[PDB]
Design a protein around this ligand. Structure first.
Ligand SMILES: [Ca+2]
Lengths: 112, 110
DNA sequence: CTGGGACCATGGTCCCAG
DNA sequence: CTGGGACCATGGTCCCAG
């Protein structure tokens, strides 16, 4: 289907410049749960540099995207860095699937 | 493609004339767990008279299909009958959705 | 080989209650 | 209006022991 990220991207535009920011209204004219608009929109708030790490945008879950976006609130720069500082390894041939991508990012927020 | 039911017939074709009826094979052919292929195929073995009882083949999930086909192994003549009525009812107004259908089909079983 | 079962994240819904 | 939280069925993987 359509990647949560790209879904959110659209939900966002829709919500902002067509719905006055009333998410109730947006989730109604899409006949979908308010919380869905939310997860998606949230994921879409991640740097496009993070969606890339995944082979396919569809690899990033709406749940895991929303989760990552929260985990890095007021820590945007760390995310961006830890992403590009992880993209360099990707270019160097280094490969990891979606599952780990999300893990290697929240890693810099954990002790070991 | 898409529909659980559709994949059943799709998975069966390859299962039969291509893999001798060796599930483990086709399973490794289309990198996917055996349980999946079992599920979809089983949905396929269901009377088309039941599948066409849903608002769209995708409404009937592999999981509940596999579930149905099982709740009527050796009682298939009970299904068509059970399903036939359901047609009269949705014909004469009555409008049930995805879930309720599987209940109605399974209700006679107990 | 094969089906059964436990397990998993996910998309999604709906309710609670300022 | 809103998010949080409790829930649910799905598709799916994986191990278990004939
Ligand atoms: Ca509506």
């Amino acid at each position: 289907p359509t990647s949560a990220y790209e879904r959110g991207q659209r939900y966002a535009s829709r919500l902002q410049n067509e719905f006055a920011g009333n998410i109730s209204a947006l989730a109604d004219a899409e006949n979908i749960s308010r919380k869905i608009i939310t997860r998606c929109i949230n994921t879409a708030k991640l740097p496009k540099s993070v969606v890339a790490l995944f082979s396919h945008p569809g690899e990033l879950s709406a749940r895991s995207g929303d989760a990552l976006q929260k985990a890095f609130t007021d820590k945007e720069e760390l995310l961006k860095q830890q992403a590009s500082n992880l993209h360099e390894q990707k270019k160097a041939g280094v490969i990891f699937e979606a599952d780990e991508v999300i893990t290697l990012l929240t890693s810099v927020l954990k002790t070991s």
